[PDB]
Design a binder for this molecule. Structure first.
Ligand SMILES: O=C(N[C@@H](Cc1ccccc1)C(=O)N1CC(C(=O)O)C1)c1cc2cc(Cl)ccc2[nH]1
Ligand SMILES: Cc1cc2nc3c(=O)[nH]c(=O)nc-3n(C[C@H](O)[C@H](O)[C@H](O)CO)c2cc1C
Ligand SMILES: *Cc1c(COP(=O)(O)O)cnc(C)c1O
Ligand SMILES: *Cc1c(COP(=O)(O)O)cnc(C)c1O
Ligand SMILES: CC(=O)N[C@@H]1O[C@H](CO)[C@@H](O)[C@H](O)[C@H]1O
Lengths: 791, 790
């Protein structure tokens, strides 16, 4: 009945929408035909959901982020709507392979990593929980670049994801808005005027966000820059305004103070706030109840400008008195802190802001005066306190500390993991938290069980549902029921078979994609995340070389075989990250082609790591590498995906790793290396990498091989830069955790030789992953920050 | 496809396609819902038509043009498909106004004027005649600019026609192709290689072209430039390649040798030829029969590069020997000449071509040598003949004469009107026509009766069909049957009522759009075409001022009232055209606000003249101004639209105007002024505008008022530039035709006072318009140049 109508709709779309028949249709046409067939099932509910929010007017949540790492939409939509099985059958009956059609879809890679994926995971949870929430960002013409490996090096290729069209976005021409830039401030008797500005239009594109089996369809609104309204040159120059939403800055945890980036931040903030204000004034709910109807979450400081923009609107446009506007503003905004790394901190030079946003610079100054006046009144003698709490930094050049603007403009500030939120509250912003202790909170990150379990690992989800029901999908805490099977050998072998099939499926991937032959029974050791010195795939590379030498030493020694996979993109300007990639492809080349090691150890640099590819490798993983230096990874989410999918974790007591051990029992994770306190002690005492290289014979060998050209014969000093940083500038102490790491790694393999105990531990991990659902994360945000409830 | 199912489809699209309901839908959503509803009716026939061409493999026609002035598509499609009445009813039942929805659609203004509209009219006729024809152009992101009038001056606004989406285009991703630029030529032992080039991808977008009531749906394929595959800057720099299809050059009859324009020309040529070759090799058809399967018409010299590109492909890629390739090339191409005006002539500097297209420059040189060798062999003593017939001009800087390249690479060359084709053949290219007399031809232009009668003037089409049947739609020569009603007073009054209702409808337009109050019973005097010194709306402006003074002179004099309308866009760099516009808005301001003239004379500068707006004003017109200097307007097509729609013509013996008099009887048109020979005689003898200003008292007054600030008090010398050109540099002799013009105009008004005789003449015009159908034009092209059949 349903299968029949689905095949009918597909043929209808292929004909009328793609203008094709079965003899001339391309694979891309079949994908689009299916996408349209599935898309139609979203319309009724999307209209009803948005209409419901208008009628019953519940408090609305607006997740304002410069990034939304959404991945592919077809499968996700089919699943949340309960149409996957019917569609799978419809496509099969028509003689096609749904998997092939699914591969046609481009990832919507409008994010760099964890930050943009958290936003994506949050949209899915907010819809599944039935909250009146909206995602607001920029519709980048180009997302995170596609990565290629040339002569072992990363090469960037433009990610032209819209070239063939996106059936999942809906232009909303009637809501276009003008955004202002430059110009000059004019203080009149009717109020202050921001005049002589250049205008860039913002056209919003709505993408539906289907809740998991609940008839709710929320919206993700992305803005695209358009020019307003020598002739030829004047028309070509329209490219200049449209360049604002042209490309996503491909840096993870790195502030790049480019003027264009500033424009993107203001662009999305101005369009968004105007749209929210307009929706408020049409709600039939004059802004007294604004914050009882509106909640705006600042995802990192990127949209910090939203604070003085709201004030600008309230004061300059709506004519509200400063005091009242300031109060509403704080009740409206909440700020989420995502990192304590110095290079990620946004500090915009007042000069640049003055030229681009002169009125906003005056507003920020005013906020700062009112702010410092309060502090001067309570702590008179304390002069330096004012210096430390100011939104303005006069170090060399004067600049705005965006993080401080976010704190004073918000009623709630949160970190993303216990350890991180603690550091944010008591160390980094001690001066602020002391004054307003109730302001700072923690909201441990999470991942959505739909995309990261049900979609990416159907085999595992089925096994679990077979044993404990399907309720866990909407309430992952349900996974603890998996404990009852701890001594169940048949279940443990079923668990091990699912993982075995994931590995085989992914092995097929690696062999067609890459030269090398993979040992499907080897242990899959994986580290996939953005290349960073702080995340240390370098430390991992030190271990791979160690295992290499060891085999070369004693060839016939009983060695648990491994397929080591390291994948991730480096920001374009990050030289060390790029050197580390080359170092890894070099090592692999030597290991994979050495006859004495052969099928014992294989190394793969998984290129173009991205959301759709994460969905493949993660379910096939046995060992998840989460080895950042303690105190560096604010939270992490990749660690959670691997835990939910049956992999054991080797890592430090950092970010959310700590809470994973808490939930699963430290004994059921391979924790190692320095802890927050240990890195501190070492810092005070002073770190000298040279000493470990001295003490550690296995390390000295690894290092001498790198620095001598053993892994770059034609370029003997190619890795000279890596050697120098490690010996004289390693802020992340690679050599200091090397011994504990290799020791920890040895124990992992020992446990791997015992299938029954390895799988018993995996079970304890999966049964303990319930806390890491973004459904739980969102619930806490909802009741402790946004003050909202399901609809 | 009746009313109930049409309303159903509309609601379905509004819901699933526009994601709306009746309470939140916008007017734009309603337009799109209807467009999609109508579009669906094209799919079956479009797939079957293209499939038919593959199976039965008839010789195909490819109209290669840098311009396609298509206008709006909804109404046209509804009409050619016989769905207009049903849709009209469906939309009405749903509580909407189809006229309002139709106004939402943007014109597809991918052309400047006559040249691009001729291409558009040809696509409609080729589909109605059932020919296997394709239109190949560039999908400009921006078409001809939208014109605004600020402080009486034209201002240009970007024509962002794709902003909200084009439901009539279909991306054809599987046929994307790479186009090459720059690089360098490498002569090897395996053949010549064009290497180290930069690549720009070309993605084609197909638009259906429905034939009139015949199940045929052809294709118009437009190419869009896309880049292949410091980081941020590198991605932004992708804008540079995509800039190739960014904007239409807004010049009419004017060559602007900009490098970007050269890129556009090669771009469309390279993508098009590769696509045609590929389709040829898949036809199930050896390039021996290539020209028996392919015909490529060069619309003006703009795609001239297609000749050495085809050769490049045949020789460098397909490895054919030069002689064989050259033969197939000539049998493939045919060239159409659209103008004899010097500023429109394409002469690209060999330097620029050398850098951008080094391999094509070598090919053009080779063609020129083989060409001159032939001429040297037949006319040894004649040295200067070689200089005159060369594709290369060494005057100052060396440059390529694109027109000469088109002549030698084509087997047929045609003009667009008898008088023009004659000049092209015997005067301009005498050296070539003498050698190959059979090469040069004429193919008088035409307009499609669908868009230009049935669509734009439903009232007239109905009246005609009521009296002589509907066969005239597909065979306009049928209009001669209208003669039988020449003495029929009731028919003549019915004819006059249709024109009366057009005027009222358009008057509603002019009053809401413009301040002024219009006399619906006044004579609508109209001149709408691109602003050009050669088209002379200036001469027209001299007459308006004349009528003005006359009224001021004798207020109570019996004067047939007029609503004078002049509209058109000036190219951005054309200073004189812009000055003339300002001069016209200035005059209007004075006339329209002068209490002594009042409702006697009103002047309007119809802004943003374009295809959809032509469809409104043309049917409402009584008098059509076709007054270019004799010998300047190669043909004209606006003249034909007005004739088919019931307007009388006042004009010179130029372009197709001459043939209009031939068909309708010179007596039934208001011809005047110098003729081709008269302008020549005056040229030899020397023209001195000062003498007419001397002799003509009415003229002297007009001129003194202009030059003294009567029409620009705050800027007394504002029109100084206009005065100078008219006295010392008027290549188009405005003062010389002024007297004959005003005299001719006086007679027009005299005939207008006699409704029965005016309408009797209009009837003789309409009944004689059959020759000007583009169906007849295409039939002649098909049997005498392309050698193709339905
Ligand atoms: O564009 C059409 N369908 C659309 C269908 C579509 C819509 C959204 C996403 C993917 C596909 C189409 O093919 N594309 C939009 C993409 C782009 O903008 O690049 C590609 C279309 C159907 C049709 C049918 C007729 Cl009869 C005439 C013109 C037509 N265009
Ligand atoms: C038929 C014709 C077309 C012209 N088109 C243009 C044009 O498109 N742009 C421009 O800048 N000038 C144009 N001109 C003006 C020309 O370049 C030159 O400036 C004047 O003719 C010198 O008086 C045109 C002139 C003529 C006669
Ligand atoms: C989850 C995810 C990340 C974040 O990974 P971490 O290891 O937690 O930094 C990055 N990239 C992609 C594509 C992801 O799916
Ligand atoms: C037909 C047409 C033209 C050509 O008119 P002429 O009077 O022949 O110059 C130019 N522009 C538009 C919009 C047209 O419809
Ligand atoms: C170069 C150019 O645009 N020429 C124009 O071509 C059209 C189409 O043939 C003619 O009707 C017109 O008189 C002529 O001015």
């Amino acid at each position: 009945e349903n299968v029949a109508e689905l095949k009918k709709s597909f043929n209808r779309h292929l004909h009328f929408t793609l203008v094709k028949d079965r003899n001339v249709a391309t694979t891309r046409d079949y994908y689009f035909a299916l996408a349209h067939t599935v898309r139609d099932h979203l319309v009724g509910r999307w209209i009803r959901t948005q209409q419901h929010y208008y009628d019953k007017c519940p408090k609305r949540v607006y997740y304002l982020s410069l990034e939304f790492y959404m991945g592919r939409t077809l499968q996700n939509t089919m699943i949340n709507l309960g149409l996957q099985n019917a569609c799978d059958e419809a496509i099969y009956q028509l003689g096609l392979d749904i998997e092939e059609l699914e591969e046609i879809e481009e990832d919507a890679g409008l994010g760099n990593g964890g930050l943009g994926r958290l936003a994506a995971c949050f949209l899915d949870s907010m819809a599944t929980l039935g909250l009146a929430a909206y995602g607001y960002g920029i519709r980048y013409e180009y997302g995170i670049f596609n990565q290629k490996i040339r002569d072992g090096w990363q090469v960037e290729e433009a990610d032209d994801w819209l070239r063939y069209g996106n059936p999942w976005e809906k232009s909303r021409p009637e809501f276009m808005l003008p955004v202002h830039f430059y110009g000059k401030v004019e203080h009149t008797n009717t109020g202050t005027k921001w005049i002589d500005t250049q205008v860039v239009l913002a056209l919003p594109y709505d993408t539906p966000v289907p809740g998991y089996m609940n008839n709710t369809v929320n919206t993700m609104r992305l803005w695209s820059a358009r020019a307003p309204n020598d002739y030829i040159q004047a028309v070509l120059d329209r490219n200049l305004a449209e360049n604002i939403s042209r490309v996503l800055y491909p840096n993870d945890n790195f502030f790049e103070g480019k003027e264009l980036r500033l424009k993107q931040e203001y662009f999305v903030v101005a369009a968004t706030l105007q749209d929210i204000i307009r929706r408020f004034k049409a709600s039939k709910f004059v802004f007294d109840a604004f914050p009882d109807q509106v909640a705006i979450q600042l995802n990192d400081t990127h949209p910090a400008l939203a604070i003085p923009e709201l004030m600008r609107i309230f004061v300059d446009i709506e004519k509200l008195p400063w005091s009242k506007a300031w109060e509403l503003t704080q009740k409206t905004f909440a700020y989420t802190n995502h990192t304590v790394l110095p290079e990620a901190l946004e500090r915009w030079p007042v000069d640049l802001v003055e030229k681009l946003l002169p009125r906003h610079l005056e507003i920020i100054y005013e906020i700062n005066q009112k702010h410092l006046d309060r502090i001067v009144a309570l702590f008179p003698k304390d002069v330096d306190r004012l210096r430390r709490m100011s939104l303005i930094e006069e170090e060399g050049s004067k600049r705005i500390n965006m993080a401080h603007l976010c704190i004073v403009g918000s009623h709630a500030v949160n970190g993303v993991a216990k350890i991180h939120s603690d550091i944010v509250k008591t160390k980094v912003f001690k001066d602020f938290s002391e004054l307003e202790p109730d302001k700072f909170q923690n909201k441990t990150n999470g991942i959505t069980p739909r995309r990261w379990l049900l979609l990416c690992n159907p085999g595992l989800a089925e096994l679990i549902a077979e044993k404990i029901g399907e309720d866990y999908v909407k309430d992952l805490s349900q996974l603890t029921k998996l404990h009852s099977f701890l001594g169940d050998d048949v279940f443990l072998r079923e668990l091990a078979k699912v993982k075995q099939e994931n590995k085989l499926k992914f092995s097929q991937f690696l062999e067609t994609e890459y030269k090398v032959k993979i040992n499907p029974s080897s242990m899959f050791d994986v580290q996939v995340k953005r290349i960073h010195e702080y995340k240390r795939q370098l430390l991992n590379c030190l271990h791979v070389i160690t295992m290499y030498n060891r085999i070369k030493k004693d060839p016939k020694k009983l060695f648990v075989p491994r397929t080591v996979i390291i994948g991730g993109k480096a920001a374009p300007g990050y030289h060390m990250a790029k050197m580390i990639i080359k170092l890894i492809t070099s090592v692999a080349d030597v290991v994979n082609n050495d006859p004495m090691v052969g099928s014992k150890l294989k190394v793969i640099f998984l290129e173009n790591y991205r959301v759709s590819l994460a969905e493949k490798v993660i379910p096939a993983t046995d060992l998840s590498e989460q080895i950042s230096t303690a105190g560096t990874e604010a939270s992490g989410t990749g660690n959670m995906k691997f835990m939910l999918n049956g992999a054991l974790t080797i890592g430090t007591m950092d970010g959310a790793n700590v809470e994973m051990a808490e939930e699963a029992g430290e004994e059921n994770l391979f924790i190692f290396g320095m802890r927050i306190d240990d890195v501190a002690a070492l810092d005070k005492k002073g770190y000298e990498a040279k000493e470990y290289y001295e003490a550690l014979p296995e390390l000295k060998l690894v290092i001498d091989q790198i620095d001598n050209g053993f892994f770059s014969p034609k370029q003997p000093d190619l890795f000279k830069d890596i050697i120098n940083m490690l010996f004289y500038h390693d802020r992340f102490k690679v050599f200091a955790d090397y011994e504990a790491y290799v020791k920890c790694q040895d124990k992992v393999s020992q446990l791997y030789m015992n299938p029954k105990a390895w799988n018993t531990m995996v079970l304890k991990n999966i049964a303990a992953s319930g806390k890491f659902s973004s459904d739980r994360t969102i619930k806490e945000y909802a009741q402790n920050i946004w003050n909202v409830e399901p609809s």
